[PDB]
Amino acid sequence: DADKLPHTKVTLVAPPQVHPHEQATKSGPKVVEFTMTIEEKKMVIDDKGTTLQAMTFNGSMPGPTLVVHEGDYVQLTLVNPATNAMPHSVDFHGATGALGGAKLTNVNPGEQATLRFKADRSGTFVYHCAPEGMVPWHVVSGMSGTLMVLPRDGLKDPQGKPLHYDRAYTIGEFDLYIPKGPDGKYKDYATLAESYGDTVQVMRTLTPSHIVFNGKVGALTGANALTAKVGETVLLIHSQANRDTRPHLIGGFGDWVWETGKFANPPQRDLETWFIRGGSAGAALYTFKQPGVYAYLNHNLIEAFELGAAGHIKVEGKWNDDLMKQIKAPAPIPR
Template sequence: MRHYFLLTVALMFLQPAISLERIQQTLVPPPLLPAHELTSPGQPKIIEVTLTIEEKELEIDDGVFIQALTFNGSVPAPMIVAHEGDYVEVTLVNPATNTMRHNIDFHSATGAMGGAALTNIAPGEQAILRFKATKTGVFVYHCAPGGDLTPYHVVAGMNGAMMVLPKDGLRDGNNQRVTYDKAYYIGEQDFYVPQDAQGNFRRFTNLADALEPTFEVMRTLTPSHVVFNGRKGALLGANALTANVGDNVLLIHSQATRDSRPHIVGGHADWVWQAGSFANRALADIETWFVPGGSAVAALYEFKQPGTYVYVNHNLIEAILLGAAAQIEVSGDWDNDLMMQVQPPSPIP
């Protein structure tokens, strides 16, 4: 009888979520976001996602490899999108072929170490976590197995971001509704690749061999690489982000461990939701914005001119020498009123 009573009480607490519509969200590799609506009127929903842990070798620069730890195989992990009041139900899968325990800490969640205490799984196990998205904004998520292994898992690639939109959509600093034509997720990642006596980057055949040498580099707090989306040059050239003149583009930038300073060379941010919070008033016309380590920030910009825009961490040492740079190729007609070349380079008279 007592067990029946406890079950009844438990079901009463679960009932608000049980009766809601379920939506399976298909996650996609960054810089893309999953299909989503900008607003969500009506009842909250249960957003179902699956994250499968992959331990695998990744090439982060030409001829430079790491033993990576990933969610769904990408660095950063996929973006998850929900609306305020939705429930996010995450199935975390740790295949038997893996070697380490893993879990997940959502900065967007409340309680139990962001879910890390409820999702600690060994190879061959899975766990299902459901939490209510009570705060709006963009938030980091990452693996947090405890002790020294927490920073190791994060810098080995196990971090991503989640966006929780207000139910009635985004608002600018004047409390006016704003929309976006495109959205991109840039995950900045610091890597710590050991080198041999000759200065060559070492390549390891398994996680066990890579562990201690990588820790030695991590303890210096000096990354060998700082890159966007898992690899130096991942968003350059043929892989550049794209837009058209007149597009409002939402750029979501995360950094799980170090501070960053995003900047669009030749452009600005019309609106920045500083610290990633959509509940706070957005800041207008920002040249370079700040992403504190362990957070994500959203910026919105309407591109006014065509051409190749360089998007960088404006610690230019990290951008140019270590790899924290991307490009945005914008198509459209040039506006001479905004900028024109009055005289091309020529000899001084």
């Protein structure tokens, strides 16, 4: 079947954007070809210069989001340049068999491999590195992203009515485990290998030092805030490959949410806060009705405000007093 289908090649884009794609499509199934190149690198993850000996797909945390339609085949070329130190692989939660592909994509530095799998189920699915004996370290060091498999006729509400988004953003949340020295300051390592032993000790405490969206505290704030306008519906894809999170839009809602991320199930409506299980990706739609700067955050507020799991969305448009009005501004208590 796959050998008789047309092929297409998709160029990936850096998070938090998602590569252009159709939602409902008249196209039949295709072999959709992607390539990713692993990059190990030291990254600065907070405002006080703390560094992570990181590992990435395509130079970014998260890796890029791959979008296909249900019934397509994903054909990924995974490249591990000779400038990297470690072996890598890929486990697609959207794929059937061979440990998600990991058994077939074991690439040492200087190697590449090509895997094909049928994307037979709709949803947002995590992909991550999974090299034998080193899985949690590679994942928490940054090697995860999302595969979104759209239903061929687009998204649907619980009664089967059409849903859509006008803009998509992808948020990868990363629980980091940065070791400290005897002085209480975070350790800086010269090489990736030297970070291993100390990092495993922090991991085993189950207590992250930092929890960041898209690779660093404040990654999605200031000039790098997400953007939208009143009337626009945004899709927020949220992946967490290792630890639970509870997304929330301050002053908004999840109008329609697939917290388990699987589009053949009916979504829930009107959520204040939703739940992404560690090892999954979920998806929320929201149509903005008020302008302003929103926060999109993990609603364990310590994780958000102290540890880093928060971003901003700057929304243009006209304020609606029907929805919310300041009746009396802060003023002295009448006596």
